[PDB]
Design a protein around this ligand. Structure first.
Ligand SMILES: c1cncc(Nc2ncnn3cccc23)c1
Lengths: 302, 287
């Protein structure tokens, strides 16, 4: 798009507009929007921000790493501030490519038995991996791969949520930064312990999260769901790699999970290696899966 | 019943973001009909929730009636259009002077006078003593949850409160799971550790380890010796009070009643003047 500037905080007038009526009290909810110049739909994350946070947002935007677009990433369109008079708070807008069919989590929640068919898991997992491969080659770690951050377009295209990942813009607004988020999709290396005191992310941390997302697609929830988050945090580096509960799954799927879920990131395969895994590489029903997913989308849209 | 909750249209308007009790945001709310101020904790009702907010509202109305706890007014449901969750509005007492964190950040040198720390710490302890006798653990004592009214009254907010971990800096060692503590216990005494961290925050402008990434702070809290005031300027009674709050093993940590008898808390002859001095600061902070 012609009027996109990812390096500056601008007024959205004449660039983007909300289509849904946005009320009072926003803190990260996503609304249908539109690119004014092209008419193309957009997803707009809206947050009420203080005058102080706006100054901070400006610096964070300067630190945004850049990367070309990719069919498996919901294109990030920038950050905007919609001004209010002094005293009353302004609103930060984070703008992204619109994905109509909702998240992978909603898809599984809406599916009978909260389990997706294996060939659907293979298709979705490959698209996630292709999205990650693109970020990784540009030296960007997603950091929040989970079913809720993997979206479907109307045409069953798979896209990773990008509301400014290379500077975690959506997890800093209302002091959500000082906070440890949800731990269920966290790799062992991102959690500090005796052998790992400097809990440092690596590109490979996204691959562990991708494996947890594949279990989430298979069982409707990540392995340590409902457990107090502090206990999940203690158990992740200690427990054996999570494994699918049901015996119904193919050997290739169990094998794919073993690849993602190597606890020691130094021994965990790269995104390129996981893309060559038979579960991902061999998809002869790929044409049909898209058709099957596209029908599930159109049937839930009523 | 949750269905009995009315729409806030024509009753309350959201003015500006004041805090965050995450879940959701906290707003300075203006009563449309009277012009009177209130704090509004806005949250999306997944429902799901149902019992979760029902028991939050239940404990808000049950325990808000103590001079050291901000009083609960009522609740509203802002019905949202399809495709979005409805919003729950919890209306609370607006504490005009803001949080003790803001107070210290606005103070020159990011340090409060010792007799102010003693006064604030005692009111926190009195608020905690009320919750503890009613078998309630606050679980989130920190400068951001300790507020000052315009009359320099000290009030606690966001008590008795879930798949995410908040900020870890004020967490007691027992609330953090490790080899020797796999269960991550919450005891009434966990609030006392947090109270000690809040006293350091009042003294230095930030809790110990504020620098560290939250995950690293989480690893260091059970390992590091009890935090201690950096400056040598503080009195021995204040160092002694911190030693009392900051006993790492909660089984050996004094109760709220024992800490209320500590000389730093018990001996406050300038109590009348401190309130005057605090009221002066808050009324001065108007620009
Ligand atoms: C409930 C839960 N978490 C935070 C709050 N914050 C406030 N509440 C009341 N007055 N006030 C003035 C400034 C900030 C606040 C309340």
């Amino acid at each position: 798009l012609v009027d996109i500037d990812l390096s500056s905080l601008r007024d959205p007038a004449g660039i983007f507009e909300l289509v849904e009526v946005v009320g009072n009290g926003t803190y990260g909810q996503v609304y249908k929007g539109r690119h004014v110049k092209t008419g193309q739909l957009a997803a707009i994350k809206v947050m009420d921000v203080t005058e102080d946070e706006e100054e901070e947002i400006k610096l964070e935007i300067n630190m945004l790493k850049k990367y070309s677009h990719h069919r498996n990433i919901a294109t990030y369109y920038g950050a905007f501030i919609k001004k209010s008079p002094p005293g009353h708070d302004d609103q930060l807008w984070l703008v992204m490519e619109f994905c109509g069919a909702g998240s992978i989590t909603d898809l599984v929640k809406n599916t009978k038995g909260n389990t997706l068919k294996e060939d659907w898991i293979a298709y979705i997992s490959r698209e996630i991996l292709r999205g990650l491969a693109h970020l990784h080659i540009h030296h960007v770690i997603h950091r929040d791969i989970k079913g809720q951050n993997v979206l479907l377009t109307e045409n069953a295209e798979v896209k990773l949520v990008d509301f400014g990942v290379s500077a975690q813009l959506d997890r800093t607004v209302g002091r959500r930064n000082t906070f440890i988020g949800t731990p269920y999709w966290m790799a062992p290396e991102v959690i500090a312990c005796d052998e790992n005191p400097d809990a440092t992310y690596d590109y490979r941390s996204d691959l562990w999260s991708c494996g947890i997302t594949a279990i989430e697609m298979a069982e409707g929830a990540p392995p340590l769901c409902d457990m107090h988050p502090m206990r999940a945090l203690f158990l992740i580096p200690r427990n054996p790699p999570p494994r699918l509960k049901s015996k119904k799954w193919s050997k290739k799927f169990f094998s794919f999970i073993e690849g993602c879920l190597v606890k020691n990131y130094m021994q965990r395969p790269s995104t390129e290696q996981l893309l060559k895994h038979p579960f991902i590489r061999d998809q002869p029903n790929e044409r049909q899966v898209r058709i099957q997913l596209k029908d599930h989308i159109d049937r839930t849209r009523k």
